[PDB]
Amino acid sequence: ASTSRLDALPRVTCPNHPDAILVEDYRAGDMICPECGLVVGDRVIDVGSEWRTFSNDK
């Protein structure tokens, strides 16, 4: 079904650096692998959105 926005996560760590947990925002950008320092991502506009809270009002 193509109804869901995305809610998808990046690739399990760096493809070449398993220990290098590509951090968020490469110096204020995409995903940076502190090891190779690769930048993955482009325009995320914050995806997901699942509320995840306790008790609702409306």
Swiss-Prot record:
Where is DNA bound in this sequence?
R52
Q: Which residues does the annotation say bind Zn(2+)?
A: C14, H17, C33, C36
PTM comment: the record says: Acetylated.
Residue ranges annotated as zinc fingers (TFIIB-type) are: 10-41
Expression across tissues is: Expressed in the inner cell mass forming the embryoblast. Not detected in cells from the outer thin layer trophoblast (at protein level).
The compartments listed are:
Nucleus; Chromosome
What function does this protein fulfil?
Answer: General transcription factor that plays a role in transcription initiation by RNA polymerase II (Pol II). Involved in the pre-initiation complex (PIC) formation and Pol II recruitment at promoter DNA. Together with the TATA box-bound TBP forms the core initiation complex and provides a bridge between TBP and the Pol II-TFIIF complex. Released from the PIC early following the onset of transcription during the initiation and elongation transition and reassociates with TBP during the next transcription cycle. Associates with chromatin to core promoter-specific regions.
Which family is annotated?
Belongs to the TFIIB family.
Q: How does it assemble?
A: Found in a ternary complex with TATA box-bound TBP. Part of a TFIID-containing RNA polymerase II pre-initiation complex (PIC) that is composed of TBP and at least GTF2A1, GTF2A2, GTF2E1, GTF2E2, GTF2F1, GTF2H2, GTF2H3, GTF2H4, GTF2H5, GTF2B, TCEA1, ERCC2, ERCC3, TAF1, TAF2, TAF3, TAF4, TAF5, TAF6, TAF7, TAF8, TAF9, TAF10, TAF11, TAF12 and TAF13. Associates with TFIID-TFIIA (DA complex) to form TFIID-TFIIA-TFIIB (DAB complex), which is then recognized by RNA polymerase II (Pol II). Found in a RNA polymerase II initiation complex. (Microbial infection) Interacts with HIV-1 Vpr.
Q: Please give the record's comment on domains.
A: The TFIIB-type zinc-binding domain is necessary for the interaction and recruitment of RNA polymerase II to the core promoter, the formation of a fully competent pre-initiation complex (PIC) assembly and basal transcription initiation. The C-terminus is necessary and sufficient for interaction with the TATA box-bound TBP complex and for the formation of PIC.
Q: What name has this protein been given in UniProt?
A: Transcription initiation factor IIB
- State the species of origin: Homo sapiens (Human)
